[PDB]
Amino acid sequence: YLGQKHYELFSTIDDIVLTILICEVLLGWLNGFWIFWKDGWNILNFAIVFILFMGFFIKQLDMVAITYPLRVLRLVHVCMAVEPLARIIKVILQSMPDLANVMALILFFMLVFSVFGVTLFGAFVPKHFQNMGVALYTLFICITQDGWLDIYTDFQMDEREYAMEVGGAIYFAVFITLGAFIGLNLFVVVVTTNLEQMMK
Amino acid sequence: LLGLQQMILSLTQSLGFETFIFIVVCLNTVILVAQTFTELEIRGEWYFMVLDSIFLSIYVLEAVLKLIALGLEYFYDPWNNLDFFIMVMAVLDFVLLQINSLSYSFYNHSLFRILKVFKSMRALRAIRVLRRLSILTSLHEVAGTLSGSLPSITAILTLMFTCLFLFSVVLRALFQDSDPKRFQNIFTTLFTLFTMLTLDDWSLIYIDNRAQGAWYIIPILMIYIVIQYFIFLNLVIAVLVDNFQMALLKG
Amino acid sequence: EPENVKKMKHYLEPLLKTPVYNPLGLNLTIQGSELFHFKVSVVPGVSF
Amino acid sequence: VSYTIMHSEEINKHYFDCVIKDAEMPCFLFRDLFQPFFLVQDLVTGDSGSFLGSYVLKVVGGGRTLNTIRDYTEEEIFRYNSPLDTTNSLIWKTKVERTTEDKKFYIMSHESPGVEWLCLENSPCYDIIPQSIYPPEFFFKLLVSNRGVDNSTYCDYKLTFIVHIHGLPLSSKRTSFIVMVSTSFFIALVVFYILFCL
Amino acid sequence: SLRILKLISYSRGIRTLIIAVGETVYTVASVLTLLFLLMFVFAILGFCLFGVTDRGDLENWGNLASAFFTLFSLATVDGWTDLQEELDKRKFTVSRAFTILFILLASFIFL
Amino acid sequence: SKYDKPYADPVHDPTWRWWQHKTKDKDYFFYLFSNRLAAEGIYINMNAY
């Protein structure tokens, strides 16, 4: 209802922002292609304008799904340059490599306990415990610790009293609580660890 | 050959243990990650259990070599004690399958699932004995700093267990003849306490208890939930934060 | 195009030198600025 | 056909054919519980009903491949398909309380739990070996009869058909043999390594 | 309630607490702006992925306010299971991967 | 005489096995016969047998 009198103006402002972005890129390349190529953040802006201009001038299936997020990525990059968000973004990108090891350890412990899971998975209490990657992601859903009472009723009443209804349930429940606590801790600890790097 | 046999066993244990144990447990973990894999077992089920029994025979040879080995200090390693327990369970299930006959239920019974999770323990042991090389020093240091504050977290989980048991006791005492079908026994009572502890449908508990005639159990439930929730998670978060923080204060 | 007009279209499209469509699902799409004049005909041999 | 395949895909929640797939003849797994359903086909009118009656099921022949089916004798049928044979010769075994006269065979209807295969020590399963890669295959010629177990019609249906079973299991003797020979050969090789390293 | 807030405007100890916590307004505003930017990015992405095709999933990744509220729910732990069951029937297998990536980014980072 | 197979087909009328892979394009066959561009000018119907 708004776009029927705005599509032409949307096209014009798309062209205007694309041409000012490529003019900025050319002005940055004027000082030297080596320094612009050897930079931490100018590479991202160059890739953004490169993908956008290839999708504009040449035919592309990029559609709105590429045109719009690329613009808001440029928005993020520009609003980072003004000072009072730059420190927090800087410490976020400093904190990511320390979060990488925590993520890898969590995934490895996840695999070595998902073997114990899939010993009692597959072809019974199925469709979330089978398919061997859907089982992994359902365990990830459960470790994210919200709304697993649908799962609790899914394996409910194996014998209605004890069966494996006690065993497998207490096993993956204590594994869920230990993994969730350890992961949430290790996350907040990596955060504060890299913020002590921020204020030194 | 007494101590002479022991020293021969030490040298040849180094050499042959390294070579043979590494190669055969690599192949064991290959066939065991091919085994679980609940798509390819239908492209199998006949070349799978035979190789499983073959490498279980290799593992009982490992335990035989360790039994004729140096002995008491072998039992002084907790991982080696886990090897001994895993192999006791393995020879138990192997002879249970071997004798056949029997008089109890079979054809994928609960005992079969017990043997399957025993196979999972064996697979985990294979995984842990292929990582003798290159555990990577970064995550080694991360795990070493993570395991520094063990008494604090054990005390906190002990307090969690005591508080959860007290809350389960008082709730089951207050839930008598109050449609207890969800928590009719001790296991379901502690599981429901875990669900209240883990932010899982306690609002649903409030809304289907409002359909009942008892109301004060709902303020009791929220006050218990909030005190245990805030206290425990603040305790563990703060404890582990400071636990890595003094290691941060060093090099 | 279902698997009911595959042989008929494959036979007809060579010797009429014109693409052949199936009705009951036809939709048009236009990118122009003018007056379009369309004629819709039935292929020969199926009516009088 | 469709009811049997869909029951197999709904009880065990998985299904897989043989290597050489035949459209007319599908394949059945050893691990899957076998509960056949049957149809009564009138060739003079268009109706095709479901056999809601009792029957007796037994295996009357067996072969390693096609055109290798050999007939069995009366005491052979007794040894192979009956709970009253003391020898380890049960091809299959079912848990049901209704049996025929002299308790010899099993009476089954469409409400039966199904068929679990055994093929014990005195069966073609025992001491079987593959002829090539992929699990071994067997063919069981088995009949469904209606002789003394129905009082609704005036003549019985003798459906003697053939079925394919792949994924045949191994004897405990075979597993014990391969385990013990692997242990003996590997301790021999490791002791050779130990002695020659000195 | 604003009158009650004027009541609590007293109690100089709470004033000292407010002074001790008042230097963080810029910081929490910066984190809120980061949250809003990430919310906007995944808002346009979710509308492009599930609202543009118009084969279902309306008022979850469709209308802008409903899409924003569903994304705010997904950035938290609440409502993820029912939303996941809602999205997997729209013939989009990679939607599950995108949603779990969005969870492991947004929820962990924000909290 | 060959319908004595002991395995049940989804449909009766054994000629269903005959006219199944060919009935997807019956109309085309008629187009070839009405206009006289087919075979010996013989139209073999499918519902006639």
CSV table of C-alpha atoms in Angstrom, one decimal, chain A:
chain,number,residue,atom,x,y,z
A,1,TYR,CA,0.0,0.0,0.0
A,2,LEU,CA,3.0,2.3,0.6
A,3,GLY,CA,5.2,0.8,-2.2
A,4,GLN,CA,2.7,1.5,-5.0
A,5,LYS,CA,3.7,5.2,-4.9
A,6,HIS,CA,7.2,4.6,-3.6
A,7,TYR,CA,8.8,1.9,-5.8
A,8,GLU,CA,10.2,4.4,-8.2
A,9,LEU,CA,11.6,6.5,-5.3
A,10,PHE,CA,12.9,3.3,-3.7
A,11,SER,CA,14.8,2.6,-6.9
A,12,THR,CA,16.2,6.1,-7.1
A,13,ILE,CA,17.4,6.1,-3.5
A,14,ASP,CA,18.9,2.7,-4.0
A,15,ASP,CA,20.9,4.1,-6.9
A,16,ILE,CA,21.9,7.2,-4.9
A,17,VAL,CA,23.1,5.1,-1.9
A,18,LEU,CA,24.9,2.7,-4.2
A,19,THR,CA,26.7,5.5,-6.1
A,20,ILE,CA,27.8,7.3,-2.9
A,21,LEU,CA,29.0,4.0,-1.5
A,22,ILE,CA,31.1,3.2,-4.6
A,23,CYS,CA,32.4,6.8,-4.6
A,24,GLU,CA,33.5,6.4,-1.0
A,25,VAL,CA,35.2,3.1,-2.0
A,26,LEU,CA,37.0,4.7,-4.9
A,27,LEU,CA,38.1,7.6,-2.7
A,28,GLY,CA,39.5,5.0,-0.2
A,29,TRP,CA,41.3,3.2,-3.0
A,30,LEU,CA,42.8,6.5,-4.1
A,31,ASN,CA,45.1,6.5,-1.1
A,32,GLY,CA,46.3,3.1,-2.1
A,33,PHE,CA,45.0,-0.3,-2.9
A,34,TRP,CA,47.4,-2.1,-0.7
A,35,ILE,CA,46.3,-0.4,2.5
A,36,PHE,CA,42.6,-0.8,1.7
A,37,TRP,CA,43.2,-4.5,0.9
A,38,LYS,CA,45.3,-4.9,4.1
A,39,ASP,CA,42.7,-3.7,6.6
A,40,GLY,CA,40.4,-5.3,9.2
A,41,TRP,CA,37.2,-3.6,8.4
A,42,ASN,CA,37.5,-2.0,4.9
A,43,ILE,CA,37.5,-5.6,3.5
A,44,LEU,CA,33.9,-6.1,4.8
A,45,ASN,CA,32.7,-2.8,3.3
A,46,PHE,CA,34.4,-3.6,0.0
A,47,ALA,CA,32.8,-7.0,-0.1
A,48,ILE,CA,29.4,-5.4,0.7
A,49,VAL,CA,29.6,-2.9,-2.1
A,50,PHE,CA,31.0,-5.5,-4.5
A,51,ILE,CA,28.1,-8.0,-3.9
A,52,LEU,CA,25.6,-5.2,-4.1
A,53,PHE,CA,26.9,-3.7,-7.4
A,54,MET,CA,27.3,-7.2,-9.0
A,55,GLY,CA,23.7,-7.9,-8.0
A,56,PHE,CA,22.6,-4.5,-9.3
A,57,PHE,CA,24.2,-4.2,-12.7
A,58,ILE,CA,24.4,-7.9,-13.5
A,59,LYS,CA,21.3,-10.1,-13.2
A,60,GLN,CA,21.1,-11.9,-9.9
A,61,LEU,CA,18.8,-14.1,-7.8
A,62,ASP,CA,20.1,-12.0,-4.8
A,63,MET,CA,16.6,-10.4,-4.4
A,64,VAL,CA,15.4,-8.3,-1.5
A,65,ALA,CA,17.0,-11.0,0.8
A,66,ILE,CA,20.4,-9.7,-0.2
A,67,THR,CA,19.7,-6.0,-1.0
A,68,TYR,CA,18.2,-5.2,2.4
A,69,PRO,CA,20.6,-7.0,4.9
A,70,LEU,CA,23.6,-5.6,3.0
A,71,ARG,CA,22.3,-2.1,3.5
A,72,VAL,CA,21.7,-2.7,7.2
A,73,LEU,CA,25.2,-4.2,7.5
A,74,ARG,CA,26.6,-0.9,6.0
A,75,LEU,CA,24.4,0.8,8.6
A,76,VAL,CA,26.0,-1.1,11.4
A,77,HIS,CA,29.5,-0.4,10.0
A,78,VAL,CA,28.8,3.4,9.7
A,79,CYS,CA,27.2,3.6,13.2
A,80,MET,CA,30.2,1.8,14.6
A,81,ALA,CA,32.5,4.6,13.4
A,82,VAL,CA,31.0,7.2,15.8
A,83,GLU,CA,32.6,6.6,19.2
A,84,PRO,CA,30.0,5.5,21.8
A,85,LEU,CA,29.4,2.0,20.5
A,86,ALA,CA,32.8,1.3,19.1
A,87,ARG,CA,34.4,0.2,22.4
A,88,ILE,CA,31.6,-2.4,23.0
A,89,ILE,CA,31.8,-3.7,19.5
A,90,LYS,CA,35.6,-3.9,19.8
A,91,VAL,CA,35.4,-5.9,23.0
A,92,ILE,CA,32.8,-8.2,21.4
A,93,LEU,CA,35.2,-9.0,18.5
A,94,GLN,CA,38.0,-9.5,21.0
A,95,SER,CA,35.8,-11.9,23.1
A,96,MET,CA,34.8,-14.1,20.1
A,97,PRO,CA,38.2,-16.0,19.8
A,98,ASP,CA,38.0,-16.9,23.5
A,99,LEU,CA,34.4,-18.0,23.0
A,100,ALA,CA,35.5,-20.3,20.1
A,101,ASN,CA,37.3,-22.8,22.4
A,102,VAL,CA,34.3,-22.9,24.8
A,103,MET,CA,32.0,-23.6,21.8
A,104,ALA,CA,34.3,-26.3,20.6
A,105,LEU,CA,34.6,-28.0,24.0
A,106,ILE,CA,30.8,-27.8,24.4
A,107,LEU,CA,30.3,-29.4,21.0
A,108,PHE,CA,32.8,-32.2,21.7
A,109,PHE,CA,31.3,-33.1,25.1
A,110,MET,CA,27.9,-32.9,23.3
A,111,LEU,CA,29.1,-35.6,20.8
A,112,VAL,CA,30.6,-37.9,23.4
A,113,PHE,CA,27.4,-37.8,25.5
A,114,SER,CA,25.1,-37.9,22.4
A,115,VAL,CA,26.6,-41.4,21.8
A,116,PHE,CA,25.1,-42.3,25.2
A,117,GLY,CA,22.0,-40.6,24.0
A,118,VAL,CA,21.7,-42.4,20.7
A,119,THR,CA,22.2,-45.8,22.4
A,120,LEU,CA,18.6,-45.2,23.7
A,121,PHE,CA,17.5,-43.3,20.6
A,122,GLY,CA,16.1,-44.2,17.2
A,123,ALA,CA,13.0,-46.1,15.9
A,124,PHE,CA,11.5,-45.7,19.4
A,125,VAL,CA,10.3,-42.5,21.0
A,126,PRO,CA,11.2,-41.2,17.4
A,127,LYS,CA,10.9,-38.1,15.2
A,128,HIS,CA,13.0,-36.1,17.6
A,129,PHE,CA,15.4,-38.8,18.9
A,130,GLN,CA,16.1,-40.3,15.5
A,131,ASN,CA,17.7,-39.0,12.2
A,132,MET,CA,21.1,-38.6,14.1
A,133,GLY,CA,21.4,-34.9,13.4
A,134,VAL,CA,17.9,-34.0,14.4
A,135,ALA,CA,18.6,-36.0,17.6
A,136,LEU,CA,21.7,-33.8,18.1
A,137,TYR,CA,19.8,-30.6,17.5
A,138,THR,CA,16.9,-31.7,19.8
A,139,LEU,CA,19.5,-32.4,22.5
A,140,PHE,CA,20.7,-28.8,21.8
A,141,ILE,CA,17.1,-27.6,22.2
A,142,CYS,CA,16.9,-29.4,25.5
A,143,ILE,CA,20.2,-28.0,26.7
A,144,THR,CA,19.0,-24.5,25.8
A,145,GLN,CA,16.6,-25.4,28.6
A,146,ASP,CA,13.1,-24.2,27.7
A,147,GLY,CA,9.9,-26.2,27.0
A,148,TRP,CA,11.1,-29.8,27.1
A,149,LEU,CA,7.9,-30.9,28.9
A,150,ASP,CA,6.6,-31.7,25.4
A,151,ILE,CA,9.6,-34.0,25.2
A,152,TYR,CA,9.0,-35.2,28.8
A,153,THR,CA,5.5,-36.2,27.7
A,154,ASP,CA,6.9,-37.7,24.5
A,155,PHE,CA,8.8,-40.4,26.3
A,156,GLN,CA,6.3,-40.6,29.1
A,157,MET,CA,4.8,-43.9,30.2
A,158,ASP,CA,7.4,-46.4,28.8
A,159,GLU,CA,5.9,-48.9,31.4
A,160,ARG,CA,4.1,-46.1,33.3
A,161,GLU,CA,6.1,-46.8,36.5
A,162,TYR,CA,9.9,-47.1,36.2
A,163,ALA,CA,11.2,-49.0,33.1
A,164,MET,CA,13.7,-46.8,31.3
A,165,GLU,CA,11.3,-43.9,32.1
A,166,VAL,CA,13.5,-43.5,35.2
A,167,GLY,CA,16.9,-44.4,33.8
A,168,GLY,CA,17.2,-42.5,30.5
A,169,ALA,CA,15.2,-39.6,31.9
A,170,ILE,CA,17.5,-39.1,34.9
A,171,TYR,CA,20.6,-39.6,32.8
A,172,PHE,CA,19.9,-37.0,30.2
A,173,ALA,CA,18.3,-34.7,32.8
A,174,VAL,CA,21.4,-34.5,35.0
A,175,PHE,CA,23.5,-34.2,31.8
A,176,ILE,CA,21.2,-31.3,30.7
A,177,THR,CA,21.5,-29.5,34.0
A,178,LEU,CA,25.3,-30.0,34.2
A,179,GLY,CA,25.9,-29.0,30.6
A,180,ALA,CA,23.6,-26.0,30.8
A,181,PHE,CA,25.1,-24.6,34.0
A,182,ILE,CA,28.7,-25.2,32.6
A,183,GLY,CA,27.9,-23.6,29.3
A,184,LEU,CA,26.2,-20.5,30.7
A,185,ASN,CA,29.0,-20.0,33.3
A,186,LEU,CA,31.8,-20.4,30.7
A,187,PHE,CA,30.0,-17.9,28.5
A,188,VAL,CA,29.7,-15.2,31.2
A,189,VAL,CA,33.3,-15.9,32.3
A,190,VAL,CA,34.7,-15.5,28.8
A,191,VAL,CA,32.8,-12.2,28.7
A,192,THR,CA,34.2,-10.8,31.9
A,193,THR,CA,37.6,-12.2,31.0
A,194,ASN,CA,37.7,-10.1,27.8
A,195,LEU,CA,36.2,-7.0,29.5
A,196,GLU,CA,39.1,-7.0,32.0
A,197,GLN,CA,41.1,-6.8,28.8
A,198,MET,CA,38.9,-3.8,27.9
A,199,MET,CA,39.5,-1.6,30.9
A,200,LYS,CA,43.2,-2.2,31.2
